[PDB]
Design goal:
Bound molecules: tetradecanoyl-COA, the ligand Cc1nn(C)c(C)c1Cc1nnc(-c2cc(Cl)ccc2OC2CCNCC2)o1, magnesium ion
Shape: globular
CATH architecture: 3-Layer(aba) Sandwich
Helix content: 10-25%
Number of helices: 10
GO cellular component, one term: cytosol
Catalytic activity: N-terminal glycyl-[protein] + tetradecanoyl-CoA = N-tetradecanoylglycyl-[protein] + CoA + H(+)
Number of domains: 1
Family: Belongs to the NMT family.
InterPro entries: Acyl_CoA_acyltransferase (IPR016181), NMT (IPR000903), NMT_C (IPR022677), NMT_CS (IPR022678), NMT_N (IPR022676)
Order of helices and strands: EHEHEEHHEHEEHHEHEHEEEHEE
Strand content: 25-35%
Protein name: Glycylpeptide N-tetradecanoyltransferase
Radius of gyration: 22 Å
Distance between the termini: 30 Å
Oligomer: monomer
Length: about 400
């Protein structure tokens, strides 16, 4: 049934995942010297290509492939349109490895046909607290804590095959070649997400949406006027009134994050994330890169009281193409990124997120039910969407965990 994922080091079934108790590796311990030095064989009409993320043309090529061929919703109404500036930010974090961005081009015209990206991440991915306490009481704490130390692994995203090339087994060939390039750097684990079911997720979380411009959302059929809104005489006025937001933030200490905030945000974020079972570890340079405001890409606000940053939130932008709508070309979506609250309830901090997003012209705020994102769903008027984001490891045994125990936000 899975001609490719059968040949790979991942759990093969739910309830192998349900069985697993300790974190740890799957494949044979291997060495760099074992890995072929030559690229994986590919048909002679194609060629492997390592884009230069510092070249505007190369970024443009990847931008057009993804604009026309990347992720759609289940009804083919929307497709992500990541910007070139977003792709530059996502694909070139501190100490990125240029060789981990892998593409396939047609040799004759150099047309981009397929792409996959890997970047570094430092991830806590040892045994979950729940399996560790079981282990303690059963005598096995040492084996449980064996892989507690954050690991320098690969995070995979932006897998894409051109629509004209679909179901020709090109995605396996890409994943093989990315794995070879990563393994040649002496890295042996990857983390990735997908909105499809594959063998086998260690966590799954529902999508959630918060309407900011319900007029537009209904016009492009992201949303409907719910049946309940019919035995009111007036549908849309009532819908606007329901989702209306203040014009200005209500926390008085709120301002955009600036470079001098990097150490304190790093500290309050690391203290919050270290509570979850699977989560990233960031250096100052990675906090700067992923959280300092960048126009049209990432937006970050701190609450500063008496010169001390005590809370912050961030969100990132992905516009979606509205596939065949006359009136609207684009859906302008904000996605909740990292945050930390120490002085105010999380609902109060995220309200300010919604207020800034709406003021800056976003149409909806989207998120997955990871981190403590459930604690503000009802009071902030989020709704569950129709789908789940699934979390996976390559070469890592891991128990099934709840999504409220995951702290890795994917872009
Ligand atoms: C140590 C380092 C390791 C690094 C590598 C770690 C692994 C990284 C893994 C990648 C994580 C990516 C994270 C993201 O970016 S998730 C986003 C994925 N991108 C899209 O959804 C964009 C729209 N779709 C496409 O471009 C194509 O449909 C793709 C490229 C998805 C498949 O192309 P196509 O439709 O032309 O099919 P094929 O005949 O060539 O290949 C069929 C095989 O592909 C397996 N397939 C289908 N979808 C996915 C999927 N989303 N992840 C993994 N595998 C997937 C499928 O089960 C089948 O295997 P098997 O069932 O026959 O066994
Ligand atoms: C395309 C498209 N555009 N829109 C607006 C939607 C709801 C889709 C479908 C869709 N596919 N994924 C999501 C998603 C939906 C939500 Cl609510 C939150 C995160 C989502 O995925 C992100 C970005 C890419 N990497 C994983 C995290 O939404
Ligand atoms: Mg294919």
């Amino acid at each position: 049934a899975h001609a490719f994922w059968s040949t790979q080091p991942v759990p093969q079934t739910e309830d192998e995942t349900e069985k697993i108790v300790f974190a740890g590796p799957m494949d044979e311990p291997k060495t760099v010297a074992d890995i072929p030095e030559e690229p994986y064989p590919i048909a002679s009409t194609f060629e492997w290509w390592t884009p230069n993320m510092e070249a505007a043309d190369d970024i443009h090529a990847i931008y057009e492939l993804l604009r026309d061929n990347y992720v759609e919703d289940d009804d083919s109404m929307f497709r992500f349109n990541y910007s070139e500036e977003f792709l530059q930010w996502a694909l070139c974090p501190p100490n990125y490895i240029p060789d981990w961005h892998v593409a396939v081009r047609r040799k004759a015209d150099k047309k981009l046909l397929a792409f996959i990206a890997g970047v570094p991440v430092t991830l806590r991915m040892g045994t979950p607290k729940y399996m560790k306490v079981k282990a303690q009481e059963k005598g096995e704490g040492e084996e449980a804590a064996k892989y507690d130390e954050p690991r320098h692994i690969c995070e995979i995203n932006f897998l894409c095959v051109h629509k004209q090339l679909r179901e020709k087994r090109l995605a396996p060939i890409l994943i093989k070649e990315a794995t070879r390039r990563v393994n040649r750097t002496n890295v042996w684990q990857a983390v990735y997400t997908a909105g499809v079911l594959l063998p086998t997720p260690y966590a799954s979380g529902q999508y959630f949406h918060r309407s900011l411009n319900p007029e537009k959302l209904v016009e492009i059929r992201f949303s409907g006027i719910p049946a309940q809104y019919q035995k009111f005489q007036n549908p849309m006025a009532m819908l606007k009134r329901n989702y209306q937001l203040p014009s200005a933030p209500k926390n008085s200490g709120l301002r955009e994050m600036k470079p001098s905030d990097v150490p304190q945000v790093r500290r309050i974020l690391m203290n919050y994330l270290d509570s979850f079972d699977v989560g990233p570890v960031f250096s100052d340079a990675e906090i700067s890169h992923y959280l300092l405001p960048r126009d049209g890409v990432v937006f970050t606000y701190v609450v500063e009281n008496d010169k001390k940053v005590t809370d912050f939130f961030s969100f990132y932008r992905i516009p979606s193409t509205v596939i065949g709508n006359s009136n609207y070309n684009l859906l302008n979506a904000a996605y909740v990124h990292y945050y930390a609250a120490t002085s105010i309830p999380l609902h109060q901090l995220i309200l300010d997120l919604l207020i800034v997003a709406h003021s800056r012209g976003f149409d909806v705020c989207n998120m997955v039910e990871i981190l403590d994102n459930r604690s503000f769903v009802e009071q902030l008027k989020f709704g569950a969407g129709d789908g789940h984001l699934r979390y996976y490891f390559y070469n890592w045994a891991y128990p099934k965990i709840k999504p409220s125990q995951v702290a890795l936000v994917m872009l």
